[PDB]
Amino acid sequence: LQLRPYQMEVAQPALDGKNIIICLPTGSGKTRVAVYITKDHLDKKKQASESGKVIVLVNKVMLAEQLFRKEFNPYLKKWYRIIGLSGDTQLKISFPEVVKSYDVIISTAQILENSLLNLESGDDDGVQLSDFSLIIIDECHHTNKEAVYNNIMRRYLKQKLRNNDLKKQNKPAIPLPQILGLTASPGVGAAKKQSEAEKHILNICANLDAFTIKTVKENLGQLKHQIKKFVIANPFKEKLLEIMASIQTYCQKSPMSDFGTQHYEQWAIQMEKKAAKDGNRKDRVCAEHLRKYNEALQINDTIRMIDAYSHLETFYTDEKEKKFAVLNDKLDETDEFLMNLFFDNKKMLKKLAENPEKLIKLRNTILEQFTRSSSRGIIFTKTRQSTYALSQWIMENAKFAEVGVKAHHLIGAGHSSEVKPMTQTEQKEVISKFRTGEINLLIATTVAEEGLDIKECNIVIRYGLSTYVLVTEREIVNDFREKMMYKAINRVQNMKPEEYAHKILELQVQSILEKKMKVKRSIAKQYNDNPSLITLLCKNCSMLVCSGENIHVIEKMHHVNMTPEFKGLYIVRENKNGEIICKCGQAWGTMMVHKGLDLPCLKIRNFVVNFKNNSPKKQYKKWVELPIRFPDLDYSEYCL
Amino acid sequence: LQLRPYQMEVAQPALDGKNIIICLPTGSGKTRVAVYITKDHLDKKKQASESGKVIVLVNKVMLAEQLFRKEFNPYLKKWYRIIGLSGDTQLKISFPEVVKSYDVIISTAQILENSLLNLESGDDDGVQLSDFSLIIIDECHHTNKEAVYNNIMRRYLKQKLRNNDLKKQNKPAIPLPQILGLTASPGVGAAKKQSEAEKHILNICANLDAFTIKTVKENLGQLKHQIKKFVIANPFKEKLLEIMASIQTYCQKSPMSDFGTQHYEQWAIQMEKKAAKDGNRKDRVCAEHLRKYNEALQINDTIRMIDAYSHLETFYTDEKEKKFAVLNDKLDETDEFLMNLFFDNKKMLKKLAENPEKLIKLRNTILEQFTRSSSRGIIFTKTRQSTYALSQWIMENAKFAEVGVKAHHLIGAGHSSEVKPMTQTEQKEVISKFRTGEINLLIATTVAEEGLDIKECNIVIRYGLSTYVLVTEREIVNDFREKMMYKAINRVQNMKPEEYAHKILELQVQSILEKKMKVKRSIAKQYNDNPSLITLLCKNCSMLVCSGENIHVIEKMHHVNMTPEFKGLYIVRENKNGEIICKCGQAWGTMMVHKGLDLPCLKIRNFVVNFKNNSPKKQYKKWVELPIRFPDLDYSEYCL
RNA sequence: UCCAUGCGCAUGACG
RNA sequence: CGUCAUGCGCAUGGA
RNA sequence: UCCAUGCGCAUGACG
RNA sequence: CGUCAUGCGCAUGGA
Ligand SMILES: Nc1ncnc2c1ncn2[C@@H]1O[C@H](COP(=O)(O)OP(=O)(O)O)[C@@H](O)[C@H]1O
Ligand SMILES: Nc1ncnc2c1ncn2[C@@H]1O[C@H](COP(=O)(O)OP(=O)(O)O)[C@@H](O)[C@H]1O
Ligand SMILES: [Zn+2]
Ligand SMILES: [Zn+2]
Missing domain, CATH: 2.170.150.30 (RIG-I-like receptor, C-terminal regulatory domain)
Incomplete structure (x- = not known):
């Protein structure tokens, strides 16, 4: 396994057993470097004839399957045992056993943590950081807060401090392993200064217990060789605002704020709780309706109002069906007022909906785009409902089809937000097609932003978040943060080992003690355990x-x-x-x-x-x- | 943007780049004049194709939001970039960047000053008066002393003098901008003569560096067309004075003055320091109590003594709770003497409190008022506790409600004085209601006096400070000061440009040198910086x-x-x-x-x-x- | 391969 | 601390 | 939207 | 210079 030069030096410390971080830009293929480290580490433990275990962790399953498909197995297919362990892929044999076998492990975080939990529990299934002689991590930037990676390493710290005490006051100390760590970029959070940023970095290093950041400041040339813009473009609304104010009057509800923001929504929810704490009508009842209206507003602000008509069609038709079912086997004053208040306008409101609107403006933009250009396409946005709306609305358009552009939607998997989820399988289908060329342009929330292999795309439009387009200032602040973290990286690299050690020790202790306080409060949390009260x-x-x-x-x-x-x-x-x-x-x-x-x-x-x-x-x-x-x-x- | 005639001429000088002041009476809508100036200035810089920046400053946030809501954006919505910058409204993008963008700026003082401070600091965030080609100000009367406006302009002066020196002895001089300034009235402070007043005005002009005052002495007719009275109305006290003298006897405390004034309070505080400089009891201890008693007195003088009973109920009940908590997990000679001295009377004192009093007299006055009259209402006073007392006491009255009058309180936001503060949000709620008509009559300290849009109110009662009422000579002196400043305005307007220049130059130098002395003394201030002493x-x-x-x-x-x-x-x-x-x-x-x-x-x-x-x-x-x-x-x- | 459920986590916006 | 949106991971059960 | 904290400023009355 | 009252602005943190 030959190693590229810029990869060589950055890895070099880890071959000495230094538990370092290794950050490299995307496209540099930092995996093959990881293989070199693992293989070399295994060969060193082979020479010592001792327990050589690597337990590689990725937060997402797809990353694990990719690593088992492409990188670790093909290179180490011969010598060593491997297993592409994951939660979804059924594994007849439990984890402690694969810890007793399968020298090399791809895995996923909370599987390991669950096994360690079982060790702390009475399950009798056991595993320790002791058992491993190395750990390898990916996307270390996640290791900030109560994340799984962080939880995994936090246990290791406490044991390290015990071992430090044991060294001074005892002959034996428990073994602990090396800890690599790989990330595209360390990341910076809640920083408006260099100092807060540096503190963040130090927090990350302490969480990983690492000795140093490592970068390529020497072989930047070959990197730049292999590694290589912001463009920016009614009475229906009012028709509805009038009804909302009418309903405030019907309810004596004082917003203290405006329509079309989260603040109105939050007050609606608070009033909903209070009216639930009152058991009253027209108070919680109307908070629910107004939540629907405000959602209709803020989607309308960005979306074709036909879709708000669809939203409330769904809602009120379900209301009719609910009351109709109630009738089977009467109607309140409130419901009649609200429902008729809607239905009296519904038809004309649709007539308004027909009338020409960010969406129309955007179409004028993107159609112009599709003349320049193999055609590839990407879109970002926030909601899952926006993706469907864009897909259907674009399908209805004849121009986008006429250009030959084909478009499909994409969202995550989770079962929340009252949307039809997308399965992992179907995501793979879509990205495979976006490689085949069946669909020229994807619509995505954030799935496409990372993990999924979307690449080679000229246009990456962001609607309300290698030509770049940003329809709707946020790029500037991001650029500032990038510069700020590059400067901070350089600063930390150039630091005293003694001061560095002192700083990270203090942060490690802080984290541990904070966890202990968390556990105290948590144990104090549940106390009643009553059958029926x-x-x-x-x-x-x-x-x-x-x-x-x-x-x-x-x-x-x-x-x-x-x-x-x-x-x-x-x-x-x-x-x-x-x-x-x-x-x-x-x-x-x-x-x-x-x-x-x-x-x-x-x-x-x-x-x-x-x-x-x-x-x-x-x-x-x-x-x-x-x-x-x-x-x-x-x-x-x-x-x- | 058509400009009214009286506004036309007053603006005319500023269109030539003269850095003038512009004072106009309230109701003339001096904002639209400011827009005309800014738009014209931008159009001039457009013709020159140079950096056209305006950085408008208001001392209060509400003014800024109002300007962004109503005046600048709607008129300039089309051509130019605007931003309603403020401290409270989170702005993801920092200020230097909005200086690099957003040609037009609404803002607030210390935000700009903070950025300029950062320029002088090592924050690396930078901005200069250089960057701007114009400044616009509101309520210039504030620019007298170490105010934010004044601090902002003082830096500009020093640079001007450097530039004046550079002109004689150097080819290049740093650019500096025009400076407008708008005020309802320039104001006059600490004047009992015309001459001191004129000196004040000159001080203001020097602080603003302006060339001249400008008024409308020509088109007074249309102004008077668009722009358009003093009425004046026990044993419980003694019961308490006797106890106070009893406590002096218990303490050997010599007031050297009377009960019911600030002087007694101040001596109490001084004795409190000395007794703290003695570490003794009955000396600081009793100063604290007597402070409470004197406050009880002077509120009682103006307030229903029920409220003094409430004040000391709060106090002594908290005393009981403090000592009770102390007991958990004894009582001193002093505390027992004082507490029992109170409790032995407390009940009868309340019985006295029931007995009929500015408040009662005032009710007889204002009830009579509420028969004449859409109903609107205003009240001023000094304390925040008085507002609550008036509100509750008036609520208890059946006559005020019977007239249909509804009343609500109003105070500021600050967290001082041991009162429940009022949020900005709730202030907006109240004034909106006072426009809706839910509350007929407001109770206010000074918030309502300015900034807040309170208008169209027949009655404006002042209790102890368009019919006017003044319950409790101070109106006469105010009228005298108004006349004195009008005469002084006329005098300064009619002055030699050369003498005017000479006068303002001298004042500018005086201000600068005084700041330098301030900085010397300030740097000399902190010298020890000790860890533990x-x-x-x-x-x-x-x-x-x-x-x-x-x-x-x-x-x-x-x-x-x-x-x-x-x-x-x-x-x-x-x-x-x-x-x-x-x-x-x-x-x-x-x-x-x-x-x-x-x-x-x-x-x-x-x-x-x-x-x-x-x-x-x-x-x-x-x-x-x-x-x-x-x-x-x-x-x-x-x-x- | 699909479906339903529960749990924990992070990010962003807001209050 | 709360709200919304988004994404992720784990653990049950079924077709 | 609320809460707590720190800082600076002005005004008025007083000493 | 000190006291009180009032109002304002900024900066932190949390719910
Ligand atoms: N030693 C090497 N010599 C040449 N190319 C290499 C070497 N190691 C990795 N690469 C390149 O790196 C790429 C893999 O990148 P990948 O790991 O998918 O990126 P990421 O780090 O974002 O996962 C491969 O296409 C391969 O050409
Ligand atoms: N050019 C103009 N012609 C007619 N009326 C004007 C003009 N400019 C301003 N106004 C009036 O001035 C009023 C605005 O006053 P405003 O700025 O709120 O007062 P203040 O100066 O106290 O803030 C508006 O109601 C408007 O009618
Ligand atoms: Zn029910
Ligand atoms: Zn004590």
Whole structure:
């Protein structure tokens, strides 16, 4: 494995066992350097005939699979054992065993941490930093806060300090391993000065326990050889603002602020809690609606108002279906006022929606772009709904197709925000096509920003965040931060080893003590662990829904209430297991059909608390907040 | 942008580049004139194709936001770049950059000055008056003393004199900009004659470097067209005076003056220092109590004595809680004497408080007022406690409500005087309501006097400071001063340019030299910078509390003492982070829970000094007084 | 290969 | 500390 | 949007 | 120079 020159020197310290960081710009292929380090380290331990383990960590799974596909296996296919361990890829054999085998490991963070947790737990599954003789890391910039990498290294620190004490006062000290670290750039956070930046860097180094930053300040020429702009372009709104003010009047709601910002939203949520802490109507009820309206506003500000019509079409049609289901098996004053207030305008509002708008301006921009140019394309933005809107709206346009441009959307995987997620599989499909050329232009939130191999693209437009385009000042501040961190890197590199040691020791101790304080407060957190002290109520209608003991649990995750005395209440709904809804139409939960039972599960977001102590109403958004505990279900009971 | 006639001529000189002042009465809308000047100036620099910058300054933030909302943007929305820069409104991009962009600037004083300070500092953030080709100012009357406006212009002067010297003895001289200035009225201070007034005016002109005052002495008719009275209305006191004299007897305290004035208070404070310089009891202890009593007196003189009962209820109940906490985890001779001296009367004193009083007289006045009259209302006064008292007392009255009058209070924002402050947000809420009509009558200290848009109000009552009412001679003197400044304006306008120049040059030099003397003395001020030379003692009990080196710092603002040897002392209290209190009940500070630590912060007001040199006790009210310096905290230590 | 659930984390904007 | 948006990782269960 | 802290400034009354 | 009251501005930190 021949090593490029600029890679040679930067690696050189690590071959002496110095636990250093190694930062190199993208495109330099810092992986093959890592292989050189690992292979050399293994050969050194081979010469010593001792336990040579490397446990490489990447935060994302795709990185791990890529490393197992392309870089580590092909180079070390011959000599050593490898395994592309990950959470998703089922591995019949547990981790302690692969620690006893498979000298080399690709892996992913919280798998290792889970195993270490099991060591600290009574699972009897064990692993220690002791067992490894080396660790290798990627994207060290993540190692700042309560991140997984940081949690992994924090345990190692405490052991180091114990070992330092043991050295002075004891013959034996526990072994600890080397720690490499690779990053595209160390990063700088919350810096408006060089000094805060340097402190950040030192924090990172302490977290990694490293001896020094390392860069290539010598062979910059070959690097520049191999490694190689900001362009910037109604009555419907008012029609809706008028209704919002009408509803404030209907509600006596004082915003204290304007329409079309997060501040209005936050006040709406706070009023929603208070009205939930009141069990009143037109107060929480109307906060919910106004949240929808404000979202309609701020998407409208950036999006075709047709999409706001779509948003509220979805919303209000679901409202009709909820009330219609409620009718099956009446309507309140509030709901009638609001719903009719909408429907009286809905049709004309759509007529307004037809009328010509960042989107139109942008089209004028990007169509002009697609004449210059193999065609490649990228887009960024913030929301997942914006991506779909851009995709559909662009599809509707005849000009974009006429140019031959084909476009597809792209978002993450997580199950939040009320959007249809994208699977890992389908992401791979899309990027493979963007390499095939089926789609010329991607639409992405931040997935494409990193990890995914998107490259060779002329245009990278950012809408509201190698030609560069930035539609909508933020580039300037980023440039300033880049300059600031380069200067700080140089400063730290040129520092006294003694002062450097003193500085990092102090930061290490600070981190450890802060964790200990965290643990003290955390242990103090949960104290009650009560079986039944409460009542769950519908939050629109401050109505009794459940008690505390009638509840039960499954999977030690989900909470459901049998005892069909409860079942006499709710209503069921579904369109396209099924969904539960209130006698007032308030959404309650899902009919989880599992374990041979149609368990009526619910979600604590939508309910409100009343302690037996008569303590004030509370809203949590998650069960785990309260420390009280509910029983696990006994199928012998309810067996029937 | 068409310009009104009386505005036309007054502006005319400035279009020639003369750096003049422009004073116009309120209601003339002098902003649109400023726009005309700026736009014309920009168009002139456009014709020259040179750097056209305007940096408008207002002392208050609200003025800036108003200018960005209403006047500059709408008129110049099209051509030029604008930015409503302020301290509160977070601006991701720093100031030097907005100096490199955003041709037009609204701003606020000390932001600019901070940037200029950074230029003089090593921050590397830079800006100069050079960069700007124009400055615009509002409320120039502020530019008298060490005000921000004055500090800003003082730097410019020195550079001007250097440039004057450079002109005679050098080809190149540094560029300097025009300086406009707008004010409602120039103002006159400490004048009992025309001559002192004229000197004041000249001082203002020199500070602004202006060429001339400008007024409209020609188009007064249209002005008067667009621009358009003094009415004036017990045993409880004695009950308390008797106790005060009883306590003098208990203390051998000789006032040398009477009860119910600042003089008694000031002597009380001086005795408090001396008794702190004695470490004695019944001397500082009783000065504190008598300060409370005298405040009770002078509020009582103007306020319902129920509120004095409230004041001392608060005080003595807190005394009980302090001593009760002290008991947890005894009582002195002094405290028992004083407390029982109070409690023996407290109930009957309240009974007296029920008995009918400026307030009652005033009610008889203002109720009569509210029959004449859309209803609008204003009130002025001095204290913040008076506003609350008026609001609650008026609320309790049935007549004021019966008339339909609704009333709300209003005060500033600052965190001083032991009152609940009012946020900017809530001030906007109130004035918006006073425009809506929810509240008919405001109660205000001086906030309403200016800046805030309060208008169209028939009544403006002043209680102890377009019908005018003045409840309680001061109007006469104000009228005299107004006449005196109008005459002086006319005099200065009609003056020789040569003599005018000579006069202002001399004043400019005087100001500069005075600043240089200030800087010399200031540099001479701090000289010691010692780590630990002292001991901090409780001031009631002359007891050791801290040393000098055991102290540490955070934020380079706050001082806390870890080393729980200290922690063995104090006691904690809270009612409704938390508060620290003495083993004798003397208040010490706050348990600042920050950075993952429950740091026990303290306040130097409440402690007393003892140098290692054995120098006499000292009280400072602020840490910064002493030049000695304490270390910044090292979290590595105390990490645990 | 898809679906549902729970948990933890970071980033950005805001208050 | 709270809100929103975004992305990520882990652990359950099912088709 | 709220909270706590530090700093500087001006005004008025007084001594 | 000191005291009180009032108002303002800036800079930190947190929820
Ligand atoms: N010793 C070497 N000599 C020549 N090229 C190398 C060497 N090591 C790595 N490379 C180049 O680096 C590239 C791999 O970069 P990669 O690791 O994908 O980038 P990143 O560091 O962003 O993951 C390869 O295309 C390869 O040509
Ligand atoms: N050229 C003009 N013609 C007519 N009216 C004008 C002109 N310029 C300003 N105004 C009036 O001045 C008013 C603005 O005054 P404003 O600037 O708020 O007062 P202040 O000077 O106290 O801030 C506006 O209501 C407007 O009618
Ligand atoms: Zn309900
Ligand atoms: Zn004490």
